[PDB]
Amino acid sequence: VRTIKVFTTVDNINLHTQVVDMSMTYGQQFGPTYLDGADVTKIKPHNSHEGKTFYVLPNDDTLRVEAFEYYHTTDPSFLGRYMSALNHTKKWKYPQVNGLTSIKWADNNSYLATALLTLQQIELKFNPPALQDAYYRARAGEAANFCALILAYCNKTVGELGDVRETMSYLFQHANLDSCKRVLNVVCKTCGQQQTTLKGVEAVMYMGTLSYEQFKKGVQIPCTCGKQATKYLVQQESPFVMMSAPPAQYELKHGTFTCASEYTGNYQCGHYKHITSKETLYCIDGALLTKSSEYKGPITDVFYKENSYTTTI
Ligand SMILES: Cc1ccc(/C=N\O)cc1C(=O)N[C@H](C)c1cccc2ccccc12
Ligand SMILES: [Cl-]
Ligand SMILES: [Cl-]
Numbered sequence: 001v002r003t004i005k006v007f008t009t010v011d012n013i014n015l016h017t018q019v020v021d022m023s024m025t026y027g028q029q030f031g032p033t034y035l036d037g038a039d040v041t042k043i044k045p046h047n048s049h050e051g052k053t054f055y056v057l058p059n060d061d062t063l064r065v066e067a068f069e070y071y072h073t074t075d076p077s078f079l080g081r082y083m084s085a086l087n088h089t090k091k092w093k094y095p096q097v098n099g100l101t102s103i104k105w106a107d108n109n110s111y112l113a114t115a116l117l118t119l120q121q122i123e124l125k126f127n128p129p130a131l132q133d134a135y136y137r138a139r140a141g142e143a144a145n146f147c148a149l150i151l152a153y154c155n156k157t158v159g160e161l162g163d164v165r166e167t168m169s170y171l172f173q174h175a176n177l178d179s180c181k182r183v184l185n186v187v188c189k190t191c192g193q194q195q196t197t198l199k200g201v202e203a204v205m206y207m208g209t210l211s212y213e214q215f216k217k218g219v220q221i222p223c224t225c226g227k228q229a230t231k232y233l234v235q236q237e238s239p240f241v242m243m244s245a246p247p248a249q250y251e252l253k254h255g256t257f258t259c260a261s262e263y264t265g266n267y268q269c270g271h272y273k274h275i276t277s278k279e280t281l282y283c284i285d286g287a288l289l290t291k292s293s294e295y296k297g298p299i300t301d302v303f304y305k306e307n308s309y310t311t312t313i
């Protein structure tokens with residue numbers, strides 16, 4: 001028998017000594033086995049594998065519990081989807097642009113670069129240790145793992161056309177936004193006045209307008225009575241808000257927002273860029289950087305800082 005030694009893991013924290021037969025495939029002995037993203041199930045051990053760390057699909061209770069504790073999912077496809085993504089994201093370039101980890105354009109990743117840039121500018125704690133650890137590494141310039149995890153958590157494959165607002169919504173659902181509270185008042189001439197409290201993701205995301213100020217003053221929405229009613233923001237408790245609308249020409253003013261998603265072209269197959277408010281306006285286009293004191297262009301998301309807001313109405 002001819003047998004190198006390896007470590008198996010689901011989380012790359014808890015490592016298990018295995019001694020593998022070199023005649024038999026990884027698949028025969030562990031089930032689905034991966035190396036640095038690369039599916040090696042049907043391959044047999046090369047000598048240069050000695051003492052390396054393979055990811056395996058959980059196949060005992062120990063590994064299922066470890067996988068849930070690390071990823072916060074029992075989805076048996078999760079590991080394979082994560083590894084398939086990582087196989088690409090480890091080949092992407094992550095240049096520092098204006099002090100932020102960006103992504104050089106590849107594999108339709110403009111939406112992922114825009115999300116990654118945004119996440120470095122808002123306050124968020126991820127529930128899954130996998131996401132938290134990778135977010136810290138990405139902020140320090142090593143974003144491959146974080147990008148692979150984002151794809152796996154959003155049910156996206158490399159090359160798939162992604163929406164930044166949907167991606168942020170999925171990420172927010174994996175974050176601690178419990179303290180986040182939104183109180184709305186709705187005013188109809190007929191049904192009258194109704195207040196509702198939103199919590200978590202629904203407290204920090206709105207679709208319909210880019211302007212936080214315009215949200216505070218009120219926006220026109222349909223009432224169930226059939227009339228148009230006024231929805232306005234009573235109370236906001238969150239470290240940020242995300243205001244989205246279908247793309248449209250919008251003016252961004254230095255110092256009045258944190259950052260924004262620019263989107264150019266047709267539904268689904270357009271291109272995102274990222275606008276950030278520093279000492280002036282920076283436009284991050286993957287590896288490309290431009291700056292200007294003023295900006296007008298097609299915006300679909302705007303992010304703003306918050307802590308505690310109460311209306312004067
Ligand atoms: C880029 C993208 C990827 C996937 C999806 C939805 N399903 O797969 C959608 C978009 C999208 O076009 N989002 C932009 C920001 C968008 C969002 C909302 C309305 C839009 C109307 C016209 C053009 C673009 C519009
Ligand atoms: Cl493990
Ligand atoms: Cl969970």
Ligand SMILES: [Cl-]
Pocket residue numbers: 072127128173174175
């Ligand atoms: Cl979670």
Ligand SMILES: [Zn+2]
Pocket residue numbers: 014015016062063066
């Ligand atoms: Zn273990």
Ligand SMILES: [Zn+2]
Pocket residue numbers: 072127128174
């Ligand atoms: Zn969780």
Ligand SMILES: [Zn+2]
Pocket residue numbers: 088107158
């Ligand atoms: Zn690729």
Ligand SMILES: [Zn+2]
Pocket residue numbers: 188189190191192223224225226227
């Ligand atoms: Zn009504």
